[PDB]
Design an enzyme around this catalytic site. Structure first.
Site, mmCIF file in Angstrom:
data_model
loop_
_atom_site.group_PDB
_atom_site.id
_atom_site.type_symbol
_atom_site.label_atom_id
_atom_site.label_comp_id
_atom_site.label_asym_id
_atom_site.label_seq_id
_atom_site.Cartn_x
_atom_site.Cartn_y
_atom_site.Cartn_z
ATOM 1 N N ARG D 10 44.247 7.672 -24.857
ATOM 2 C CA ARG D 10 43.328 7.065 -23.881
ATOM 3 C C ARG D 10 42.681 8.068 -23.516
ATOM 4 O O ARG D 10 41.002 7.947 -23.647
ATOM 5 C CB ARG D 10 44.594 6.358 -23.056
ATOM 6 C CG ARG D 10 44.635 4.981 -23.552
ATOM 7 C CD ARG D 10 43.197 4.530 -23.631
ATOM 8 N NE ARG D 10 43.081 3.108 -24.259
ATOM 9 C CZ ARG D 10 42.135 2.347 -24.597
ATOM 10 N NH1 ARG D 10 40.980 3.144 -24.307
ATOM 11 N NH2 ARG D 10 42.219 1.312 -25.200
ATOM 12 N N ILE D 11 42.875 9.020 -22.595
ATOM 13 C CA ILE D 11 41.899 10.093 -21.862
ATOM 14 C C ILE D 11 41.123 10.814 -22.921
ATOM 15 O O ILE D 11 40.019 10.658 -23.196
ATOM 16 C CB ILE D 11 42.504 10.983 -20.685
ATOM 17 C CG1 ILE D 11 43.528 10.025 -20.215
ATOM 18 C CG2 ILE D 11 41.497 11.654 -19.721
ATOM 19 C CD1 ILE D 11 43.921 8.796 -20.545
ATOM 20 N N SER D 118 43.475 17.530 -17.068
ATOM 21 C CA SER D 118 43.322 16.237 -16.571
ATOM 22 C C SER D 118 44.433 15.396 -16.146
ATOM 23 O O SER D 118 44.509 14.098 -16.265
ATOM 24 C CB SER D 118 42.718 15.194 -17.821
ATOM 25 O OG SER D 118 44.103 14.609 -18.284
ATOM 26 N N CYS D 148 44.580 9.377 -11.515
ATOM 27 C CA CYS D 148 43.913 8.266 -11.283
ATOM 28 C C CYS D 148 43.901 7.657 -9.927
ATOM 29 O O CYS D 148 43.052 7.466 -9.076
ATOM 30 C CB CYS D 148 44.320 7.026 -12.222
ATOM 31 S SG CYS D 148 45.911 6.083 -12.152
ATOM 32 N N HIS D 175 49.355 -1.079 -10.477
ATOM 33 C CA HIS D 175 49.015 -0.534 -11.774
ATOM 34 C C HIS D 175 48.935 -1.659 -12.782
ATOM 35 O O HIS D 175 49.377 -2.602 -12.492
ATOM 36 C CB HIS D 175 49.509 0.878 -11.921
ATOM 37 C CG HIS D 175 48.853 1.779 -12.734
ATOM 38 N ND1 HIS D 175 47.785 2.833 -12.015
ATOM 39 C CD2 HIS D 175 49.145 2.051 -13.968
ATOM 40 C CE1 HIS D 175 47.566 3.501 -13.107
ATOM 41 N NE2 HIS D 175 48.358 3.188 -14.256
ATOM 42 N N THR D 178 50.058 0.840 -19.485
ATOM 43 C CA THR D 178 50.118 2.249 -19.831
ATOM 44 C C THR D 178 50.735 2.570 -21.374
ATOM 45 O O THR D 178 51.758 1.705 -21.729
ATOM 46 C CB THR D 178 51.605 2.987 -18.942
ATOM 47 O OG1 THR D 178 52.628 2.502 -19.724
ATOM 48 C CG2 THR D 178 51.467 2.636 -17.478
ATOM 49 N N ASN D 312 41.487 3.334 -13.887
ATOM 50 C CA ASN D 312 42.377 3.985 -14.514
ATOM 51 C C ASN D 312 42.028 4.795 -15.810
ATOM 52 O O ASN D 312 41.675 5.830 -15.897
ATOM 53 C CB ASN D 312 43.702 3.482 -14.277
ATOM 54 C CG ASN D 312 44.049 1.957 -14.849
ATOM 55 O OD1 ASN D 312 43.830 1.166 -14.183
ATOM 56 N ND2 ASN D 312 44.582 2.091 -16.146
#
Lengths: 333, 333, 333, 333
Positions: D10-11, D118, D148, D175, D178, D312
């Protein structure tokens, strides 16, 4: 009764949870990656089938559900799990890893003796309640009980065919999310299209109609093939089978047939409805596969399509216990 | 170019926003139960395709989109909508309530002239982009452009068939929720099982593959039928079709047949991929039907299953726009 | 006993369904929009709580549930429904349209007698179990039982406050979809951001912290206010409540305060869990509000956050039954 | 400009695809468990974000995106990753494992030099865009850049406080799922209530409001704390803050404190709206935190509740980008 549950997640537990409501012996559990006190909490509570009520608490170092002492053990290697010191003769293999007569057999080393592999196997025979039975007999020590789908088309083939034949056929399963299917993209370094976001997606899936069907009701072994979509749905799944048939019939006869059989001999395994609608109703519906006389059904003279719904998480779950049983009878002397 | 878009929710809207990625003319909109300031906000934002950029504001009492004043009006009945004082040539019907030449026709009275139904009609011609085409000429005033599912099957039929014939076949569309689908049970007073919990469930669905297809690609008028399931998925929808072929062949050529098409003549309508996975990607993919060469595809000698995904909300959107246009070169002389 | 349930949607039903797990009297049902025959089907099946078992069928032109003739009527106007020839004295009101003393009273003309509004009302009393009771006596003809959130927060308020007083609070309700919440955008002509796609979105929502709570528990009538989040969830809902307290104490006594209460007085109406996780477990949990000790709790001196979950569909449903009950005892004599 | 992205999911990814929308340098990736050609496919296609257009292909044994040869590498320990043969100055850390000065420094050994976390760290500085800035200068080699939520709170607290002060406050993060959150119950050996099934349920979440805000904006290290609910929602999220103010003022000036901030200093980091509704609109909105002015906002004279959403997945994605940039202005000389 005497049983054993190698590992325990989805199948592992309902199989257990099943044992109980039926007439199955409590046992021994053996699941690395889960500690004695997570299982209590982890089997007492269920997102989809939910909660329970038994005396669910630990005591003299083990799980005591509903006032009955079920050892629990741990070890990332079964050739190690006790059943000697233990004394639970029929073991169920849940895990996923330990699928072949070679991988099961391994039970024994430890000390053990008779097994059923809760999934499809490459060498192990492949029982499915309808037809399983006879084919089955005491020579067999590591039997395997083909999946959820197979268990859903099994019944439904048998009816169809024997009775109109089935010359060629296809099948769509509309699977409802699984352990695997990732929360939001990611790896499936092997399973790639289901590495993706399980909740935004309709995602194909290779499966097996080929599998047990051919492998179970062999007159077939070669006429059915099929696919699967995995959808948001939490627990149901509708098998979609289309047939070029053989004995011209009337969609109608398709009806009557499955009915006559819901009661006659597939009694407890195939169900049959026309009291429509349903949808993931079946959630918690100990059964096997139910026929929907009227929904997603359609005819074109000897070209037909039927719908059968499961409960993947626990119609199957009841079966392992029925496979499990049946054998005891035979096996026991 | 002059347009008109009677009403606007799903089609009404994207068909608005369709127009302007094209070379379409703005107009007059006319949606009862919806005021001018709701629309701007109601078009600017889309949960599924969403937001935009256009100069989105009300002005001298009408919609100005991308600094281009387009009237909007309201009236519960179209024989009253202006187009007289308006000057809006071709009118497009979204509403749903007004589906047949009888009901469109009526447009005129107000003061009108040129029209197309965003849905199936009873009496109305029934163009589909690929084929629609020549069958269509100016005799036709109130022509309709059959739907989303159909639009995805025309293309794929025409290749298959024309090319391997198709003798008999079946189809499953997995629709992704709609306008209709209750958010938690309820009346479907006429449509009963999709009255039910459209977001917990997979719910059967009468559909039209024999529909548009037969009444579009005549040579079939009679060999295809099929059904549907609405699954959680907010925007996608895979069309599943099975065929007994005619000309034996190998799912291969199903391949090249569809590829040569995507390019040759079926240009911008049919798409084809081999770079798998895909899923509900397609979301916002002005297209029409995309063959998914390798996904939820299977062969058995002259018995097969093909898979193509749509975009119900806007692959169709671009079509109206093309049915809409086409009409003009011919129609205007 | 003798009841009547005007209409039947989410509340009319589980309210029916309700009476029966209790010792409430079946009755008469009166819902425009729904045939007799769709009720049976609409009552014994349920995505969220589903199936039943009842003697669920019609007969000498009415609904027989569990062999007990409950009449069903349909008229779009209650000053018209029999209660006269009917003989059913306490009416329940689900509709939604008929929320005020003015609007309920209505009933009688036709012929009838005594009523409760399973909604929040302008002018009618606003009973809630915990507190309601004493402020309630025979003067009140059309008394009402403010919603589920409230039902959710009364107990949790009353415990905290009376006990550490409560000087100012705020609250967030995480609501879990409703009837309204369109499946894919659309009008909200009066309710707009819940006209948008409610299966994709976290969509806020005005609410009644203030509503019933002031109006129920006097001393507050000015110290609480709130909001809501509708999330995908099919049925549960968690009230998040922050309070500036009054009497210093420790997250802890918040704990015993509620536990001591779960047993003491809020007995059947307040719950209390420390056995964590939970999540939309509570599914089918006849209760009221359960406090989750440790989950979604947090302290800082006398500034705190507390978490109770509901079952908006059916904790509330038990209550109407209780409200409906108590009355009888007072009312009858 | 030179970057480098250790691991990438994801990131990892969007920081790739973020860099590019920017004026960042391509680099080299280094993600054991993922092959060069899965990357490309896994970079190309996104359930939530999706597709691209880049020259997304493998060439002379590396990934060339947009005709820019960005090298890829694989090994399960970065003290080994090249960056020496390699030459990518700044290393960014994604994986997850390797969150400490200790853990990344590790990088070096192999051959490398400058780094960013991060992720939150225990010992590495914690820079958020708004305030990170000055706190930051060159004696810092392995800097960290809080997550986030924080990024979402940072701005909002920063205006509110400084400006009306913030004495005591609490927060709710709603949220959306995930990487972890299992799609069907299961292990969370460490994190249990999230082992449970992510798709059915509303599920608490420990979080850190405490975390970087305390450790970001010095002055508060102590006044706030909070929690989180994950819901179905695929990608957006809303931080819920309740605060006992200090300077009295009124909901309103809350507005313009936030509005003048969007323009003034938090310029492109806090954003603010009043054209309401929004919802999980934000999806792909390069930003940071947006203050929704009027949505689930409420006052009561020095006790308020302001609502701000994030994204996010990729508002934070751009941040890494400029935490990264900024560093370079300074860092270089």
């Amino acid at each position: 009764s005497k049983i054993g549950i190698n590992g325990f997640g989805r199948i592992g537990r309902l199989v257990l949870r099943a044992a109980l409501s039926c007439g199955a012996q409590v046992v021994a559990v053996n699941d690395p990656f889960i500690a004695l006190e997570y299982m209590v909490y982890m089997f007492k509570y269920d997102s989809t089938h939910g909660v329970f009520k038994g005396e669910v608490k630990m005591e003299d170092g083990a799980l005591v559900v509903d006032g009955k002492k079920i050892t629990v053990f741990n070890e990332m290697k079964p050739e190690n799990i006790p059943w000697s010191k233990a004394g639970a003769e029929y073991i169920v293999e849940s895990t996923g890893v330990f699928t072949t007569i070679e991988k099961a057999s391994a039970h024994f080393k430890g000390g053990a003796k008779k097994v059923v592999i809760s999934a499809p196997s490459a060498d192990a025979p492949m029982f499915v309640c309808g037809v399983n039975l006879e084919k089955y007999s005491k020579d067999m020590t590591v039997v395997s009980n083909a999946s959820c789908t197979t268990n859903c088309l099994a019944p439904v083939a048998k009816v169809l065919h024997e009775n109109f034949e089935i010359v060629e056929g296809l099948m769509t399963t509309v699977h409802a999310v699984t352990a695997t299917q990732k929360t939001v993209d990611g790896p499936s370094a092997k399973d790639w299209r289901g590495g993706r976001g399980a909740a935004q997606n309709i995602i194909p899936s290779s499966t097996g109609a080929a599998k047990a069907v051919g492998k179970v009701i062999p007159e077939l072994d070669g006429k059915l093939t099929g696919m699967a979509f995995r959808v948001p749905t939490p627990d149901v799944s509708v098998v979609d089978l289309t047939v070029r048939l053989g004995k011209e019939c009337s969609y109608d006869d398709i009806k009557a047939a499955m009915k006559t059989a819901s009661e006659g001999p597939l009694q407890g395994f195939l169900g049959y409805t026309e009291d429509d609608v349903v949808s993931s109703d079946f959630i918690g519906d100990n059964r096997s596969s139910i026929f929907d006389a009227k929904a997603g059904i359609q005819l074109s003279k000897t070209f037909v399509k039927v719908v059968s719904w499961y409960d993947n998480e626990f119609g199957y779950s009841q079966r392992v216990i029925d496979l499990l049983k049946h054998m005891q009878k035979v096996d026991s002397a």
